[PDB]
Amino acid sequence: HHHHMKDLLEIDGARLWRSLADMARIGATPRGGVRRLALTDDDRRGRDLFAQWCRDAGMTVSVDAVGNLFARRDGADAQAAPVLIGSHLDTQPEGGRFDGVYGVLAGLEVVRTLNDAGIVTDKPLEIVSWTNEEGARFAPAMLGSAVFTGALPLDDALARQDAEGITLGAALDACGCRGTRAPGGAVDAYFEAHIEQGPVLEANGTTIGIVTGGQAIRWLDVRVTGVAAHAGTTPMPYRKDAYFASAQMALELERIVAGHAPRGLATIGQAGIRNASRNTIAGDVTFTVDLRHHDDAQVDAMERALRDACARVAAARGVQVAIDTCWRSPATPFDRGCVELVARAAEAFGYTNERIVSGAGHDAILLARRVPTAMVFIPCVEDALPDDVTRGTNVLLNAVLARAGVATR
C-alpha cells in the first residue's frame, strides 16, 4: 500500500547524532577530524561498527567482490528490487565528521525508526557504504559505485595500486572484506543524503536541498607565450608580456561566466609564471580553468567563448595562447520522480527547501546513470547542526517510504 507523507513519521534525531559521534571516534585525528582511508584498519573498524549496528537492527550484512558493504531489510514483496540508501564511510586523509558518514548512518536511523514503528515495507530496503568513494588511497573516486554500475570493470579496480604499490584486491584481503558476489544487481531507486559541501543552504537558512543532479564540467590547460625580456631595459611599447595578457584573459573569463549566470561557474585554481625572475618580463604563463554549467551545450559554449576571447586578447597584445581541454565530465540529471519525492517530503514537514545542483562528486552521480536516483542535501558550516541532521533524515525517511511502499504497520 501507499505511504502517507502527512503522517509526518519522524526519526530519533538524538539517536542519529549519537551514532555520528560514535562513528567519528573511529579514526579521530588530532585536529578533530576523521581519517578512515579506504580499506585501512580504521576503515575496517568503521565498516565493522556499522555492520554490527545493522545486525543489531535486524538486518543481514554482506560485501560484494569489491568490498561494497550492504545491509538488507526485507520487505513484504519477496521478488521486488530494493530501494537503496547509500553514501560512504571512507574519508580523505583529514576528513570531516559528516562527509559520507551522514548518509550511511541516516540509512541506519531510517531502519531503526521503521523497527520502532513496526513498519514493514513493500519493496526491500538496503543501506550501502561504497568502497573507496574518496579516490585518495586508490584511484578513481567513486570506485566502488563505478564498479557496481559497470562504469569501471572489476578486474581493473582490483588491480589499482596505492602509493605503496599495494593492490586494492590485496587491501580487500587484508581488510577481510572481499565478498564472493559479483557487484551489481537490480535496484528500484537510490537515495543519498549528504551535507551540501557548499554555502548556499546555510547562507539562505534553507534546511533541505532538493538536489537536481550534477554539473557538466570542463578542465582546461592554458599556456600564454610572450617574450621574456629584461624588466628595466625594455620600454613598455616593445613588450609582449604573457602575464598581463593572462590577467586580461582571466577578466574575460569572469565576464563570460557573468553572461551565463547563475548556472555557469569558472575557477582558475592553478597559475604560475614559468622560469620566473623578478626583473624579467613573463614569457611563459600557464593556468588552469575549471568550467561548470548545468548543461553540456552551455559549458561548451562558455569554452568556445573563452577560446575566442583569449585569441582576441593575444592578438591585441602580441602574445600566443594555447588552450587544451584535459578533462570532460557530462551533466548528470537525477530522476524527476525520485527528486519529486524529496520535495514532497520537505513540503509535507514545512521545512524550508530549495532546488540545488550537486557541485561535487558523490556515489549518487554514478548510480544516477543506471538507476532512478535522488539526493537530500543539508546545510553545513566541517560541521552540520543537529536539527539539520535530523530534518534531512526525516525527509530521507519519508521519500524512501513513499518509494518503497508500506505493507503493514
Site residues, a copy of itself (CB under 8 A): 196-200, 203, 215, 217, 219, 229-236, 238, 241, 243-244, 246-248, 250-251, 254, 257-258, 261-262, 265, 267-273, 276-282, 285, 288, 290, 292, 358-360
31 binds, among Zn ion, a copy of itself, none (CB under 5 to 8 A by kind): none
27 touching Zn ion, by CB under 5 A? no
100 binds, among Zn ion, a copy of itself, none (CB under 5 to 8 A by kind): Zn ion
100 touching Zn ion, by CB under 5 A? yes
109 vs 16: CA distance, rounded Å? 6
183 touching Zn ion, by CB under 5 A? no
275 binds, among a copy of itself, Zn ion, none (CB under 5 to 8 A by kind): none
C-alpha cell, 182 = 559479483
Q: Select the span of 100-108, 221-229, 230-238, 254-262 touching Zn ion (CB under 5 A).
A: 100-108
**Taking CB under 5 A as the criterion, which residues in 148-177 touch Zn ion?**
none
Would you say 154 or 301 has its CB closer to a copy of itself?
301
390 binds, among Zn ion, a copy of itself, none (CB under 5 to 8 A by kind): none
88 is known to lie in a ligand binding site = yes
**DSSP state letters, 180-200:** SBPS----SEEEEEEE-SSSH
260 is known to lie in a ligand binding site = no
99 vs 101: CA distance, rounded Å? 6
Which is nearest to 76 in space by CA: 119, 126, 30, 129? 119
Would you say 122 or 133 has its CB closer to a copy of itself?
133
99 binds, among Zn ion, a copy of itself, none (CB under 5 to 8 A by kind): Zn ion
Give the nearest distance from C-beta 148 to Zn ion in angstroms. Answer: 16
Would you say 65 or 380 has its CB closer to a copy of itself?
380
Burial label, 390 (beta-carbon count in 10 A; 0-12, 13-18, 19+): buried
Would you say 56 or 94 has its CB closer to Zn ion?
94
Give the nearest distance from C-beta 68 to a copy of itself in angstroms. Answer: 25
Q: Select the span of 94-102, 138-146, 256-264, 314-322 touching Zn ion (CB under 5 A).
A: 94-102
25 binds, among a copy of itself, Zn ion, none (CB under 5 to 8 A by kind): none
133 is known to lie in a ligand binding site = yes
391 vs 132: CA distance, rounded Å? 28
Using alpha carbons, list the distances in angstroms from residue 257 to 75, 245, 248: 49, 19, 14
Sign of CA dihedral 35, 193, 200, 24: negative
Helix axes 386-404, 101-117, angle to 10 degrees: 60
3-state helix, strand, coil in the chain (%, to 5): 40, 25, 40
Give the nearest distance from C-beta 100 to Zn ion in angstroms. Answer: 4
Would you say 180 or 233 has its CB closer to a copy of itself?
233
Choose which of 42, 43, 99, 196 interacts with Zn ion (CB under 5 A). 99
**DSSP state letters, 125-154:** EEEEE-TT-S-SSSSSTTHHHHHHHTSS-H
Total interface residues for Zn ion by CB under 5 A = 2
Sign of CA dihedral 199, 203, 208, 213: negative
Give the contacts of 8 (CB within 8 A, at least 6 positions apart): 348, 349, 394, 398
Which is nearest to 207 in space by CA: 356, 347, 353? 353
Buried b (16+ CB within 10 A) or exposed e, 313-324: bbeebebebebe
Give the nearest distance from C-beta 319 to a copy of itself in angstroms. Answer: 14
Give the nearest distance from C-beta 222 to a copy of itself in angstroms. Answer: 12
> Strand runs (DSSP E) across 44-178, as ranges?
60-63, 69-73, 83-87, 120-121, 125-129
**Strand (E) or helix (H) holding 358:** strand 353-358
205 binds, among a copy of itself, Zn ion, none (CB under 5 to 8 A by kind): none
Q: Which residues bind Zn ion (CB under 5 A)?
A: 99-100
Indicate the annotated binding residues for Zn(2+).
88, 99, 133-134, 194
Tell me the binding residues.
88, 99, 133-134, 194
